[PDB]
Design a protein around this ligand. Sequence first.
Ligand SMILES: CC(C)(COP(=O)(O)OP(=O)(O)OC[C@H]1O[C@@H](n2cnc3c(N)ncnc32)[C@H](O)[C@@H]1O)[C@@H](O)C(=O)NCCC(=O)NCCS
Ligand SMILES: CC(C)(COP(=O)(O)OP(=O)(O)OC[C@H]1O[C@@H](n2cnc3c(N)ncnc32)[C@H](O)[C@@H]1O)[C@@H](O)C(=O)NCCC(=O)NCCS
Lengths: 163, 162, 36, 36
Amino acid sequence: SMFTDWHEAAIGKTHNRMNFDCGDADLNQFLQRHARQNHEKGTTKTYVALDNSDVTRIHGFYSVSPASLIYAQDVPVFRLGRLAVDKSMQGQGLGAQLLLSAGKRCIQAALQVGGVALLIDAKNKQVCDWFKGFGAVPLNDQPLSLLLSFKTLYAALSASGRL
Amino acid sequence: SMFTDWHEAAIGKTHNRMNFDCGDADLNQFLQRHARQNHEKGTTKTYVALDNSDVTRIHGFYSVSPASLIYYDVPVFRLGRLAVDKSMQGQGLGAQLLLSAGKRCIQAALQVGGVALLIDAKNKQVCDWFKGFGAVPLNDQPLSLLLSFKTLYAALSASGRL
Amino acid sequence: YLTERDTKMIMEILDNPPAPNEKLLAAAFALPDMKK
Amino acid sequence: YLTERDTKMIMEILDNPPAPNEKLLAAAFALPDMKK
Ligand SMILES: CC(C)(COP(=O)(O)OP(=O)(O)OC[C@H]1O[C@@H](n2cnc3c(N)ncnc32)[C@H](O)[C@@H]1O)[C@@H](O)C(=O)NCCC(=O)NCCS
Ligand SMILES: CC(C)(COP(=O)(O)OP(=O)(O)OC[C@H]1O[C@@H](n2cnc3c(N)ncnc32)[C@H](O)[C@@H]1O)[C@@H](O)C(=O)NCCC(=O)NCCS
């Protein structure tokens, strides 16, 4: 059914950044020009999905960081700032798998240092729709931002034995 | 020199929350009424320093959570609370717990990002104590300090705690 | 910096967390078992 | 919500990070080595 002949690593020097095209210039240029610097600084960590045969080929990536939302009358979260899959590899479920893997990574951190949800940044409304697909709830007053509970994410990963 | 006959665990059911007195009612009441519930929810994780002989006795605790400061935003971990029992103060345990919280948050930050500790000071006596360690008070919020993971890492690397 | 409307929604989503859908579940089951 | 003064200060402290104090160092060395 889904593409599963890949493995995840932190963005590294070996990984072919220039072959990656997800059909968005900004996301391509983020991976090419900014991923590694930001990962070294700790501003956002980028994880890549590599082919199991060609271990320098990038099928897709995601980026995360700690953040909080302030209630007005704090919510500790991890921000999924970016997610992308190469055009050559789209429509094979890898996007979905990366959302889950980012959930996994952030939940494991949140067990140590807190966090209750994934705050998802959607670039455009086509991507925001894609996220709604997975049960991410768009905020009304921030329309290109969604929230997805760690309870929801954990339930799914527990179900499959990824936690 | 410094008290070191203690061990760190996440807040648990067996820990004597009611005997803890740091001299501040809010911090005592946080530990008594809210620590465990918040730890279960994931709103803030609380770690306690237990005596190695009386393993249910709490010498001190700290609490952390992810946060961001909006200028771009700045990924941080908030040290929301730190406290030592009055009976055990002035033996360096407070200092050790600031370091341990730094360590814990840096280890998380290696996976999921973060560059600094955002420290909440209740009063100016506590804010002074933190300045001691190189925590820089913010001008616009004087009871909030920032302490680089670069600075913290340098110290933990020096001592072989990382 | 979160509006009343959203502060209520979020609070509700967090107190009463949805079960995972089939798309979220399918992904969980496809994701290769790997480490931190 | 960061003021101009602090947005500049923090940016500078993060780009140009101070070395650890004797108080910060002494604590690092006293902290028992523990896991998690
Ligand atoms: C496509 C993205 C989200 C990764 O998804 P990927 O296709 O790898 O994942 P997955 O196969 O699980 O999901 C795609 C499938 O879901 C369905 N789907 C795709 N888009 C939507 C949508 N907006 N709404 C509902 N269902 C959708 C389709 O059946 C499609 O086959 C990512 O690479 C992306 O879109 N990046 C941004 C690029 C952009 O903005 N424009 C260029 C796109 S070519
Ligand atoms: C006071 C805290 C940090 C305990 O730290 P602890 O004493 O274990 O830390 P440590 O031994 O590393 O440092 C204390 C030593 O620092 C020195 N020091 C330097 N500046 C200060 C200062 N502003 N306040 C206190 N001690 C200071 C003193 O020599 C003191 O012996 C903590 O318990 C706390 O703040 N709790 C809240 C209680 C409160 O605010 N009021 C009640 C105080 S009795």
